[PDB]
Every structure is written in C-alpha cells, then in structure tokens.
C-alpha cells in the first residue's frame, strides 16, 4: 500500500502559491528514500529529523503542500523567514517538523511570452499565520483614501502573475516546491516507512 508520492511530485500542474494545494497522506507505506536518494532536488531541507532516516519514522498523518515560486524565493519556505512569500502566501511555523523539497521547473512551467497562470499575493494588510491560506481578492487600500471598488494608484488588485519566461535568470525561474509536514499526534501511526 505505497504512499502516492508520485501523484504529488510528478503532478502535471502545480498550484499557485497563494492558493497552495494540500494533500493528506494517510494509511500507507511511505518510501522517502526514492526522494532523498536522487540527484533531482536542489533543495531538500529537513527540520527536526534526519533526511537519511526518514524511512524509520512513523506518523499519524503526513501533509504534502505544493506550489510554484521563483528560485530566489525558495529560501523563504523555512521557519523564521520574511518576504512576500513567507509573509503573504505560505508561512511555516517556528516549530515546523518536516521537509522542504524544491527543484527548478523552467522546462515545464515557463512559456515564451510568459506563463501567467502562476500567481502570488503581493499586497496584504497583515502577515499570514502559519499554514494559513488566503484566496480573497479584495482591492488593497495602500493609502488613506478608500478604494470603493475601483482600482487605481494606491488601490491595487492584490494578486500578481509571475509571468515565467524560459529566458529568465535562474533566480527568476519557476521552482516546484513540496512541503511534507509530519503530524506529531499521540495516536496510532498510519504512515510508516517500509522497514
């Protein structure tokens, strides 16, 4: 009963980070070594666990969040970070237990003329709490004057397309990101390694 990690890492399309996708992984055998024992991931950072020993671990649930951001923003997918992504789109908690895995996806997610389908929230009144998702589209009042349903200077549509192009510099290329959250609940484990 293998965990469906392939459906996560090899999905044809990924979510925009402001509307990041969560998949619950439950009641299965998890082979993390297929992920770690590869040359595929420029980022593979674990918090609270060792990447070599993931197949020894047992959890009640594992959550797989996934989305696309720019290369220069992958560092924000970490406990304690700040920036447009950590602040307004996807926030990890200080006490995060899990792994952040990322890889360049210029070959799939860029387009000549720009791929506009991947968005991020550029304006927000306050920072997100950990694992909060905000998909609202209210006009953002950047100044003292109320916007009253009209966009203009200081009255902004809050989401922005990246517009990935294959000629972008690597820091501006799309990266697919998968965050595995390991749920630590005192209850029967349903996700264990092969062993």
């Amino acid at each position, epitope marked *: 009963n293998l965990c469906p990690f392939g459906e996560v890492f090899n999905a044809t399309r990924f979510a925009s980070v402001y509307a990041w996708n969560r998949k619950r992984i439950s009641n299965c055998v998890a082979d993390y070594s297929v992920l770690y024992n590869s040359a595929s991931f420029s980022t593979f950072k674990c918090y609270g666990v060792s990447p070599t020993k993931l197949n020894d671990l047992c959890f009640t649930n594992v959550y797989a969040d996934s989305f696309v951001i720019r290369g220069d923003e992958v560092r924000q997918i970490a406990p304690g970070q700040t920036g447009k992504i950590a602040d307004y789109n996807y926030k990890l908690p200080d006490d995060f237990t899990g792994c952040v895995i990322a890889w360049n996806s210029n070959n799939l997610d860029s387009k000549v*003329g720009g791929n506009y389908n991947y968005l991020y929230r550029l304006f927000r009144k306050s920072n997100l709490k950990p694992f909060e998702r905000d998909i609202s589209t209210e006009i953002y009042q950047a100044g003292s004057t109320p916007c009253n349903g009209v966009e203009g200077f200081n009255c902004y*549509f809050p989401l922005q397309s990246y517009g990935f192009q294959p000629t972008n510099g690597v820091g501006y290329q799309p990266y697919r990101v998968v965050v595995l959250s390991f749920e630590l609940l005192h209850a029967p484990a349903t996700v264990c390694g092969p062993k």
Partner: nanobody
Amino acid sequence: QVQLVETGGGFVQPGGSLRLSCAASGVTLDYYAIGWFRQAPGKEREGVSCIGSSDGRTYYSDSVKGRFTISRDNAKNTVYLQMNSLKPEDTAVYYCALTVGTYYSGNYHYTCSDDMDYWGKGTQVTVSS
C-alpha cells in the same frame, strides 16, 4: 533586456501642452502594464497614469483630472502621454515604466504600483512663465 526611452520633455508655459513618448524595445512578455510616473524636485516619485497592454484600459492619479491622456501605438511599441493645461505643480522628471500583467479567473489585471519591473531614465518637464 527590456529598455524604455522617454522623449518629448522640455519647457512650456503655464496652460501649454506637451506629448511625451516612451519607446519600448526588447519586450518579450505578452501582457504588461506601462505607467507614467513623475518626481517633482525634492519630493517622492508618484504615479501619473497606467495603461494595460491587451485592451488599453487606463487609470490616472487624482492630480491629473482629465488633462492627461495615456495611449499606446502597438505598431511602434510606443506609449504616449498627452499633457494639456500644464501648471507649475507639473514640473518634474517624468519616467515611464513597464511591469508584468496578471491573469486571474479568465481576465487580465494591470497594476502600476510604486514597484515596477523596468524603468526608463526619465525626461524633464518644466512649466514656467
């Protein structure tokens, strides 16, 4: 390698007109906003006008009240700012700027905020007696 070149600035008397041009080269994006901004001496830069590439939708700062018109020539990759009824308050360096547009839920969205992806070097406009 987008490059923006502003021309058409200069000196004008109060009540006169000017037509600025922003000639864009190297634009590879399909959808983008172009904005005109200005910085009067000793003050922060502010937006003046915004136009969207796909349909030519526009917005203006309140300061402009009907006297400026932004428009695009697609065949020349050039965006114009027609400035009428110019006043001394209008003295400033005018910059054009370009930034990537947005697609959401079947429609495009265009925003000229203080942060733009690309900037021209600017052209001086002086309104004096």
